[PDB]
Symmetry: D2
Subunit: 268 residues, 4 copies
C-alpha cells in the first residue's frame, strides 16, 4: 500500500535477526510487498527467525553453490507465488569469505580454494540468481544486491574486498542481460552495520584486542558521513534497497547507490 | 496519497514546458508535494508555462547572479509558504554557458569572462541557493541539483563540461553544510534530453559539426543504455529527482545518482 | 647507459614474439636491465622465441597454478642471478579465461570452474608472485602487472573483464605488502593490442559477432585516443612498464597507469 | 644527459625556494634540460631565487591573468631559446585561491569574484598556457600541470578543491587540442608538501591552534601511503613530473599520475 504495493519480491540472505536481509524484508513488507524468502542450510533456524517478520512468506532452500538448487529455483518460486505470476524484484544479500581471507591471516596466506569459494558465493552467485530468476521477472522489475565500496584498500576485509570489486564488475554485465527483459540491475553500497557477521568477522579477528575497534569504526564513519551514520540501524540501508525495488529509479541500472551516510564522498 | 505527501519543495529552473524542471515539478505535484517555483528572467513566459502544472504554485523571481534576489529569497519563500513553515526540498535545475563556451567555437577561444559567468550560473549557484535556503529547511530535507557526467571529455559540450565537473565538487562541500541541518545534498546525472535549447543546438544553432557531434552522442547513448534511453521523455529523470526528495534514500549525500539508462556503466 | 641500468628484473608472460611481455623485455634490455624470464607450458616455444631478444636471459618454468613452482621460484631466481643478489623488478604479464568465459558464449553460461580458473590465473596470481618474490626484492623495487580498464562493461570480454576488476583490487592490497619492503606495486592499463590470440579472436575464433564487436572497439579506441592508438605497436606499452620499473615514478603505488592513447579520458 | 637530455622546457610557478616548481626545475636540469622560466610579479625576488638553481635560464614575466602577457609569451619564449627552436615541455605549476576561499571563512562565505579569480588562475590558465605555447611545441612533446585529488571533499581546501576538480576537467579538453600537435597533456596529483604556500594556507588558517595540524597531516598521509610519504621532500613529486616530460610515458594523455605515496588508493 506504500511503496512496494502489489509487488512480488524474492529476498535471499536471512541468517540471523541482525541480517541486513532481515531488515530488507521487514521494510519491504511494511511497504506492501508479497515476499518469497530464500535460505541456506539452517532452514530450521531461519524459519524460526522468519515468523518474527510482519507477515507470512514461503521459505525456500537455495545453496547458491548448488547447481541443482539454482536449476529448480524458478520452478519452486512459481509454485510458491502462483502459476501465471512473475516476480517484480530480487534481493541478493549473500556474502562469504572464509576466515583465512579476512582480517586474521595476512593477505598472502589465503589459499586460492578459499578465495575461490569466497568469490563464488559473493560475486558469481549474483549472476547465477539473475540467470535463474530473470526468466520469471516482469518488465519494470528490479534486481539489487548488497555491496560495499572496494575502490580503495583497507585493513582486514582483504579478499572480501577483492570479491566486492568483482561483484561490481559482475553487476554491469548482469545489467546488459537484465535489460532485455526490461529489468534493472543495481548494487547498494552500505556503510558498516553491526550484524552478527560483522561483529565476528572483525574485530574477532583481527585482532582480539577489540570489539572496541567495532566501536571505533562506528564513530569514525559517523564522523566522515555528512549526515551521520548509525552502525546499529539497518533501516536506512533497507529503505535504499526498497527505493531500487520501487518504480522511482526507473532509469538506473548497472550501478551502485551508496547508502553510507555519504562517507565515500569525503576524504575526511 | 503518495511519495511526497505533505512535502514543501522549491523547484527552480523552469523556462518552458520542455525544461526538465518542468517535469520534476509536474511529478512532484502528482506525488503530493506543495511547490514554490523560481524563475529567472522571462517571468511572463514562466507564468503561462507554469499555469499548466496540475496545481497552482507561487512563482518567485530569482536571478542566481543577483546578490539581492538571494538575500531576499528565504524571506520571500516564507511569505509564500506561511511563516512558521519550512522547506522539505530544494531542486536546483539551472544551467548556462555563453555561446563562446559551447559548440563550434574552439575550446581555447572562450574568454574567461564567458567561462566565469557560466561557472557562476552553473556551479557556484548551487552553493548560494544552499546558503539561502538551508536556514529555512527541515531535518530530513533534500537538496537536489541537475548534472551530467563530466568524468570524460567530449566534443561540443566544452566549458559546460568543465562547469559540471566543478558542480560535482561543489555538491560535495554543500553536503557537509547540509549535514549540520539534517539535510542531504545530491545530484542527478541525466541522460541527454531534448529541451528547446538542445533541439536548436542539434539543429545546428551553434554550428553544424557541433549539432552532428551531439546527435551522434544521443544515438550512442540509447545503444549503450542497457534499458535504452529516450531523449524525448524527461519523466524518468523527474522521478529520480523525486526519489531523492523523498524519505526513501535517507542515507545518500554528497553523491550522484545516474538517471541515464545505465549508459555510463557500458563502454559499448 | 639508460633508464634501467644495473637493474635485475624478472619478466613473465612471454609466449610469442607478439606477447606484450616480449616487448617489455626487449625494451628493458635495450635500457640496461638484466632479466630473468618466466614461461608457462610451451617452454621449447618460449626458448626459441626468447632467443631473439637483444641479450640472453635465463628462462624458468612457472605455471602460476602450480603450488610447487611458486614455492621454488625465489630459490630458482637466486640460482639464476647469483646468491646474494636480489630483484629490482617483477613484471606480471599473465592472463587467461577459458572459452566459455569470453566471446560468443553467453555471459550467464560460463561455468564457475571456468570462471574460477580464469580469476586464478588472471587476478590471484598477481598476489602469489608478489608473495614469492618480495622476500627477494630490493628497496626501491617495482612490481608491475598488465591490466585493462574494467570500470565499464562491454561485449565479448565478459568474465575476462570481471577478472581484471578483481586484479585492480588485488593490486591495491599487494601494494600494502610491497610497502613494507620499500617496493611499489602498480598496474599498466594498455589499449587493445594485436597478439596472436587477439588476432585469432578478431578473426572470429570465438564466434563472429564477438570478432566484429572487438573490431568495433579497436576502431573506436583509436578515434577517441587524443594521440591515436596503434593496436599493432606494443612498444608504447612496453615503455610505460619500464617507466614504472625505473626510479622516476618513486611515489606511485597501489595505482594504475593508462598506456592507452588517452582513450579512457574521452567519451567520444 | 640523463632523462630530459636535449629537451627544452618551460617551467612556471617559482615563487620561493620551497616552490614545487623550484624542485621541478632543479631535477629537470640535473637530468639535462634547457629551461625557460616564467614568473609572476616579484620578478626581482624570484630572479634572486632562480640563480640558486644548478644552471642559468632566461626568466620571463607571465601574469596568467594578463591577456597581453599570454599573447606575447610564445614570441618572448622564442627569442629566449632561439628562432627555429620549439619547446618539448611545459610545466604549469600555478595555484591561487583567496583566503576567503580557504580554511578561514566557512565554505558559503567565499564571494564569487573571489572564487572566480581562484578558478581563473588555477584551472583556466592551464588552457591559456596551452593555447599560447602549443603553437611552438614539438611533436613527442609534453604539457604537465600540478593537481591534487579533489574527488572527495575535505576540511579547509574548500574552493581550492573545486578549482582542482575543474582543473582535471580542463586537462581532458586540453589534451584533445594538444593531440593535434602530437603533444601530451597530463596532471600530476601530489600528496601534501611543506611549501611556504601550504604552511600558511592552513594551518594558518584555519585554525591558529596549529602548525601542529600540518604535522598531523604529514604523519597521517605517511600512514595511508603504502610506500610512505615525506611532506618535506618535493623530490619524489619532481621526479614524477620529469617522467611525464620524458619519452617514457608516450601513450598517456588527458590523465592524472598520482605522486602521493599511494595514499589515494587506500581507505586507511
Ligand atoms: C570497514 C570498511 C569495510 C567495508 C565493509 C562494509 C560492510 O561489510 C557492509 C556492506 C555490505 N554488506 C553486505 O550485506 C550482505 C548481507 O550480509 P550481513 O547481513 O552483514 O551478514 P549475514 O546476516 O551473515 O548475511 C550473509 C548471508 O549470506 C548467506 N550465505 C552465506 N554463504 C551461503 C551459501 N553457500 N548458501 C546459501 N546462503 C549463504 C548466509 O546464509 C547469510 O544469509 C552481504 O553481501 C554483505 O557483504 C554487509 C555490511 C556490514 N557492515 O554488515 C561497509 C563499508 N565498508
Ligand atoms: C553527451 C555528453 C554530455 C551530456 C549532457 C547531458 C545534458 O546536458 C542533460 C543533463 C543535465 N541537464 C541539466 O539540467 C538543468 C536544467 O536545464 P534544462 O532543463 O536542460 O534546460 P532549460 O529548460 O534551458 O533550463 C535552463 C534553466 O536555467 C535557468 N537559468 C539560466 N540562467 C539563470 C540565472 N542567471 N538565474 C536563475 N536561473 C537561471 C533558465 O532560465 C532555465 O530555467 C541544467 O543544469 C542542465 O545542465 C540538462 C540535460 C539536457 N539534455 O538538456 C546529459 C548526458 N550527457
Ligand atoms: C576493449 C575493452 C577491453 C580492452 C582489452 C585490452 C586488452 O585485453 C589488453 C590489455 C592488457 N592485456 C594483458 O596483458 C597480459 C599479457 O597478455 P598478452 O601479451 O596480451 O597475450 P599473450 O601473449 O597470450 O600472453 C598471455 C600470457 O599468460 C601466460 N599464462 C597463461 N596461463 C598461464 C599460467 N597457468 N601460468 C603462468 N603463465 C600463464 C601465457 O603463456 C602467456 O605468456 C595479459 O594480462 C593481458 O590480459 C592484454 C591486452 C591485449 N590487447 O592483448 C586493452 C584495452 N581494452
Ligand atoms: C590536505 C588534503 C588536501 C590536498 C592538497 C595537496 C596539495 O595542495 C599539494 C598538491 C598540488 N600542489 C600544486 O602545486 C602547484 C604549486 O604550488 P606550491 O609549490 O605548493 O606553492 P607556490 O610556491 O606558492 O606556487 C604557486 C605559484 O603560482 C604562481 N602564481 C599565483 N598567482 C599568480 C598569477 N596571478 N600570476 C603569475 N603567477 C601566479 C605563484 O607566483 C607561485 O609561483 C599548485 O598548483 C598547487 O596547487 C601543491 C600542494 C602542496 N601540498 O604544497 C595534496 C594532497 N591533498
Amino acid at each position: 500500500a506504500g511503496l512496494l504495493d502489489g509487488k512480488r519480491i524474492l529476498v535471499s540472505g536471512i541468517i540471523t535477526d541482525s541480517s541486513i536481509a532481515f531488515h530488507i524484508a521487514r521494510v519491504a513488507q511494511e511497504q506492501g510487498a508479497q515476499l518469497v524468502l530464500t535460505g541456506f542450510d539452517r532452514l530450521r533456524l531461519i524459519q524460526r527467525i522468519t515468523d518474527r517478520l510482519p507477515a507470512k512468506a514461503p521459505l525456500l532452500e537455495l545453496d547458491v553453490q548448488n547447481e541443482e538448487h539454482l536449476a529448480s529455483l524458478a520452478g519452486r518460486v512459481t509454485e510458491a507465488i502462483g502459476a501465471g505470476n512473475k516476480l517484480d524484484g530480487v534481493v541478493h544479500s549473500i556474502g562469504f569469505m572464509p576466515q583465512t581471507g579476512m582480517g586474521i591471516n595476512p593477505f598472502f596466506d589465503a589459499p586460492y580454494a578459499d578465495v575461490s569459494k569466497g568469490i563464488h558465493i559473493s560475486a558469481y552467485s549474483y549472476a547465477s540468481m539473475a540467470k535463474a530468476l530473470l526468466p520469471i521477472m516482469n518488465p519494470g522489475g528490479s534486481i539489487v544486491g548488497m555491496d560495499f565500496d572496494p575502490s580503495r584498500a583497507m585493513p582486514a576485509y582483504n579478499w572480501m574486498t577483492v570479491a566486492k570489486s568483482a561483484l561490481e564488475s559482475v553487476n554491469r554485465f548482469v545489467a546488459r542481460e537484465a535489460g532485455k527483459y526490461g529489468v534493472r540491475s543495481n548494487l547498494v553500497a552500505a556503510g558498516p552495520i553491526r550484524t552478527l557477521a560483522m561483529s565476528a568477522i572483525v574485530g574477532g579477528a583481527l585482532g582480539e584486542e577489540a570489539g572496541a575497534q567495532i566501536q571505533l569504526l562506528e564513530e569514525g564513519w559517523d564522523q566522515r558521513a555528512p549526515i551521520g551514520w548509525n552502525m546499529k540501524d539497518a533501516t536506512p540501508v533497507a529503505k535504499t534497497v526498497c527505493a531500487l525495488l520501487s518504480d522511482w529509479l526507473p532509469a538506473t541500472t548497472g550501478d551502485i547507490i551508496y547508502a553510507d551516510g555519504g562517507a565515500h564522498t569525503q576524504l575526511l
